[PDB]
Ligand binder design. Structure first.
Ligand SMILES: O=C(O)CCc1nnc(-c2ccccc2)o1
Ligand SMILES: [Zn+2]
Length: 112
């Protein structure tokens, strides 16, 4: 089961966020249009890790986490009225963000 992230309740979200569109995103560091993560602190849009089997992205989201320490990201294309896929770099797991609606509203995302 996905547990509540310890970061969720008091997550920092930076002022002057981008309006994140409902489709058509790309990694800001490469050509990936699949497997994109929206960082819930800064609204960066970056691709997922390269898996050891050769699958996945080009590690741009994790590289960004190593620089910023911003732990929570939502997988774009998984946001629905029932929730979303939220990952914590810090806890290294998929997690629950009980403030997800609020976190997404920051970026002009109405999950409903
Ligand atoms: O790829 C990224 O940068 C962010 C998403 C991500 N990194 N690792 C995982 C993971 C780890 C444990 C369980 C399930 C998924 O997901
Ligand atoms: Zn990338």
């Amino acid at each position: 089961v996905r547990q509540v992230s310890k970061h969720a309740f008091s997550l920092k979200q930076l002022d002057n966020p981008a309006r994140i569109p409902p489709c058509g995103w790309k990694c800001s560091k490469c050509d990936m249009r699949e497997n994109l993560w929206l960082n819930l602190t800064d609204g960066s849009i970056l691709c997922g890790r390269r898996y050891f089997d050769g699958s996945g992205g080009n590690n741009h989201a994790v590289e960004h986490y190593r620089e910023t320490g911003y732990p929570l990201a939502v997988k774009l294309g998984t946001i629905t009225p029932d929730g979303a896929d939220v990952y914590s770099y810090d806890e290294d797991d998929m997690v629950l963000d009980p403030s997800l609606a609020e976190h997404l509203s920051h970026f002009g995302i109405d999950m409903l």
